[model samples]
Target: GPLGSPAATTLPDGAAAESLVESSEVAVIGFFKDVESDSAKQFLQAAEAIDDIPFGITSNSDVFSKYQLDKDGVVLFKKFDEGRNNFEGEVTKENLLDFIKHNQLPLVIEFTEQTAPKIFGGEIKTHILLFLPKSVSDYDGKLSNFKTAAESFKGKILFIFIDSDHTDNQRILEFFGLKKEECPAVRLITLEEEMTKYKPESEELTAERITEFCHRFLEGKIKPHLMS
Candidate 1:
């Protein structure tokens, strides 16, 4: 299709294509039936400009047929420690970047019903749900530090941020015996062994305290404050 195309290398085929998909923590494969097609060429050019994440392409009819990709569609696949998500999404620079950001998730997640089932009911056996009530001072700083600490756990556990401003959010916090007036609080919920929750004694909600809480939980030093 060109002077020097990928020739089934980066634009792969057969086992090479399969290998590329399995090799990535997150693989974005642009599937098109013809290498000369407009959608195929456009995605290839855009993918070159993207950085960090692994990207691959396949114009193989077999691959196209196998994945049921009959259009200019892009698919996302993730192979995390315990949970690996299946194919979803598109192949555009903006869409790819957005998918990459969301891919960083087995790190720290924003809790919502749409994603909660994907995370909670998936392979992650435990979750660290951090709640921030409305009208709290240093809210941004506290949340930022919590996210930084979450980098340490990554796929080891689930980290969630729940803003306790609504009735539903308040109900979740109430389960931990924490109130909205406290403004900022947290809980550790485990769906492993038995579904349980842990609440650390009131202290400055710093990154250190949060990190220590996770470490102790793994070490079996933390006690159950709530049973789910």
Candidate 2:
């Protein structure tokens, strides 16, 4: 398949769907009403155009029943852990691709200036931002540390790392009034809680201290950093 074109294997039955999903790193299954349904073909074309990502489709009722899928459309399943992630509303090619990309993001994601507007500004209902200095080289140390510190808040919070070298995340760094030495810092923000923001205010960036910060957040102990 060339760029912008589509390709994927057709899954025959319940067992086939299960085998593909469980084996592949990330796979999507389209359960159609029948071989002639528009959704079925559209799904094939979409999967084909995407390239590399494995996809399969089936009209078998047993397959549908096995996965407890009662409707027509697609379900994305990741090999390691991403459970049955579904896309609601109209399932066009664009939305289908977006859903794939969104689900592929790691539980602990690296936030960049380009994605900041959409994810941080848009989806920060309950997000934790990690602002690290230019010296940090990514998941090698800083990211791993952040993950170890905040593994408990997996689904509850969106963890994003902002590296100063990449873009002008300095705005947020200064927003927290972070000094040059305090480069690798963490902040918990919840927009639903009236634009509330909480920094670690920790002496050391150890997992224990970070765990306490998260515990304090859950217990509603940390005071919100008001913007003045």
Candidate 3:
């Protein structure tokens, strides 16, 4: 079956309930009376250029009506003083970038056959799977090699391993449609098929190769000026 559909939820307004966004986090909320306003257009462009930043536009009437912010401009949520009218800026392009960089660390793990099957059929993606040696004696060395390769792409790659000798061997084998006897190989899958297509082979999984592949995919998939 295809992946699940996007979930829907109601967003709260400012006056309805004051929910504190985590401290030291940047949130971008834009309020616009006219969707075609120049300020709104500029803000959208800037926001899209930011990678890994959590941003949302608050042009929805329900939100503005509840927040009671003036309906013609944008608001950057932070701390502010009414007497000085000095709005403390909580969200900025720089702050957003910093937050993403600081938090987007890579996660690496070695999985035995038992755990491998669960992961293979689960929602998790963007991982590297190393097929370990049949004998336990040589598995450690292969794991070390996989770790070294994975570490080279620390911020960009998530690495995992699967040992053939475990309870979940059959499940893992069935998910990948491979037999347990065919061991000592490497497999990689990304969240999107297009990302997987960019490499498609273990030879293309080198650090430089993976980086270039990602760059090309992004350049083609995401167009900053397309909305205009």
Candidate 4:
């Protein structure tokens, strides 16, 4: 694992696959019928282009059956959001890289300039965002609960957090009609026809509270709070 150029790890068995998947926040494993095939080579090239996530390959039949993969494909395993995602199609560097970028995010993603494109450009139109300043005493606890609640609404709703401590996020608060004084709050926004915002009655950032808020939103019980 050199700094400049890193290579993919070869996972030979199911146990090795399991260990690699659990070792990181997100892991990509390419299941190929032939490791020396052009598809596997393309997977390796895509894997080498990205340096942050762990990438592995396996040709073992037992491993293939364990994951129920019948053909050559790549699976991105993550800690949340339906557990894993499958990519089966043409294998090229761009294709695999797009697949990895699309599925590599966490259950609760923080908002930043770099991540905003992925957030808004994703297929999911509904988003539940937790607004809190990182300087707060209980920021970690609140974020942890938010993430726990997010796991329940994954794929259906994208969970995000905006730090009020950062001046850059002030515009995001403005977009949702939230003021900095209202630091630990949650809002659900759906961008189907136009943008509509929903605010839960209370600002409690507990897992149960956030979960209920999202549950009601999805059930068509929560009314729109604002329009943008």
Candidate 5:
């Protein structure tokens, strides 16, 4: 079967449309009453701009009902986070592309040059940074615990890992007022007028400990760290 096309494929019906969602890690489907509509045209334009995620289009009423779309709109289906994201407001090539980029990331995203934009561009303002060297023996073990704790926060706080081993990431370590010797560590940065920062009381990085740190953040029990 044709997996993905540079252009949006016209889905025949709900059954074909349903299968397309599951075909890739992320997929975008435009449900329009007319394929030539302004929104539909913009959807296709956005499709051409993004080459990775599969894009589909359907004018089938059954398909619209299957997804509970009352009018012309676009939906992004990912393997995570409630399964689907709906495009609202004005639809254009820029807006649709932004929508796709915003929802395509996993819950616990890695911090790198490529993903930095997506991580920073996220609507979620608060972020948790885990600074850990990739070469460490317990890297996977610690990362597993980090990921487990991230599941509970979801949309409230974005979880990111900055590889201390990466020389380029030294700036990020400094941004959080951390050094290579201070890792593996956790820091919370909330995007506000002042951009407050906080560090967990304990140095241990475990699932339970991370959860407690997050809870303290919510309860406003943690103190903001002053950068040196």
Candidate 6:
């Protein structure tokens, strides 16, 4: 009696219990009235021999929950309209490995207006800021210096440039509370709170100083994967 475990519960030969087992991991569910058909038998044998991947079979049901099963590491699904004749394939050891790897990776950033609030609220740790010069004349020497500094810290920093001469640039500048007169000199702000009461000093700012400030603020905060 001790050898009998609750996990060893068995269902009738034709019951849908097999589907529940396959649903727990990556699996293929197939429906065929002719289980003895050469093609069906061959397919099932091949799938089972490929590797010890998870999957199962079931008859048609009016209600079935949705589940993602990775076949060869790619998720496959059948539409509800397809009825009980649904099947999944390509489930392999390699695919399962890849599925785990992908899930573990960080999500890619998709910059958008809706995400902007989160960015400003400090929910987004890494971002780029651009300072716009009002005129080409303002950017003459300063732009080159900023460009050099940005390149030196490319992977570690996000940088953008806005030309004050462009109407769009001017609008963005105004939106950020910059004055039209402050064109030519741009300030780079990092960290959400640092932007709250930001004001450029009358004294000239150097690119080195700006880069240093960003480095200091980002210390121990940004994720290593993002920096790479």
Give the best candidate by lDDT.
Answer: 4
**What is candidate 3's lDDT per residue for 40-85, written digit by digit as tens?**
4555555566534333454566775665654444343433211111
Per-residue lDDT over 126-207 for candidate 6, one digit per residue giving the tens place of the 0 to 100 score: 3444454443575657556755665566435444454444454455557656574655453444553343322333444566
lDDT of residue 202 for candidate 2: 53
Model 4 segments more than 4 A misplaced = 1-27, 34-56, 61-74, 77-102, 135-140, 177-183, 203-205, 222-228
With a 3 Å backbone cut-off (N, CA, C), the pairs that clash in candidate 3 are: 79-88
Q: What clash pairs does model 2 have?
A: 5-49, 6-48, 6-49, 7-48
The residue pairs found clashing in candidate 5 are none
lDDT-based ranking, best first? 4, 5, 2, 1, 3, 6
Q: List TM-score per model, in order.
A: 0.49, 0.54, 0.35, 0.60, 0.62, 0.32
The global Cα lDDT (0 to 1) of model 4 is 0.70
The Cα RMSD of model 2 versus the native structure comes to 6.9
The segments of candidate 6 whose C-alpha lies over 4 angstroms from its true place after superposition are 1-130, 134-148, 191-199, 215-228
Candidate 2 per-residue lDDT over residues 178-209, each given as its tens digit: 65665556666677647776766657644565
Model 6: residue 166 alpha-carbon error in angstroms: 5.5
**What is the lDDT for 160 in model 4?**
79
Better of 1 and 3 by TM-score: 1
Candidate with the larger lDDT of 5 and 6: 5
Candidate scoring better on TM-score of 2 and 4: 4
- Tens digits of per-residue lDDT, candidate 4, 161-228, equal 76775567767667666674655666666777775677766645366666777777667773676434
**What order do you get sorting by TM-score, best first?**
5, 4, 2, 1, 3, 6
lDDT string for model 1 (134-211, tens) is 627866776567556665665466567776657766565565565645565667777756766777566864566677
lDDT of 6: 0.41
lDDT to native, each model = 0.60, 0.63, 0.46, 0.70, 0.69, 0.41
Whose lDDT is higher: candidate 4's or candidate 5's? 4
